[PDB]
């Protein structure tokens, strides 16, 4: 549904059922494995979702940081003699004269 905890609990119940069935043993064996696996799976799913959101935020920040890296590399990837070219003269002057303020 919508709750990561509910999804994880359902996934754990289904995993326990599938493991019991594949084992060829009858169901309703080791019932303590049912709630335990459900809780474990719910926790794992919630943690995975939270990590995914945090990783999305961090990746957005990292891409924003890397935006200037690509521009500088393309400026550094200008062909030998193409740095002073009219199509690149403005960028070369801005990056070397204006963007030198350390």
């Amino acid at each position: 549904m919508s709750s990561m905890l509910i999804w994880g609990a359902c996934f754990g119940l289904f995993t326990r059922a599938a493991a019991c069935k594949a084992s060829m043993i009858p169901l309703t064996t080791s019932p303590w494995k049912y709630p335990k696996y459900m809780i474990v799976s719910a926790v794992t799913f919630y943690y995975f979702d939270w990590y995914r959101r945090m990783a999305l935020e961090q990746l957005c920040y990292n891409e924003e940081k890397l935006e200037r890296y690509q521009i500088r590399a393309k400026l550094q990837s200008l062909k030998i003699g193409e740095e002073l070219s009219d199509a690149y003269r403005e960028s070369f002057f801005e990056h070397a004269v204006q963007k030198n303020n350390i």
Partner: peptide, 12 residues
């Protein structure tokens, strides 16, 4: 998404 985030700092 996780792999893209991991690779994001590879060059950054």
């Amino acid at each position: 998404i996780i792999l893209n985030y991991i690779s994001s700092y590879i060059y950054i």
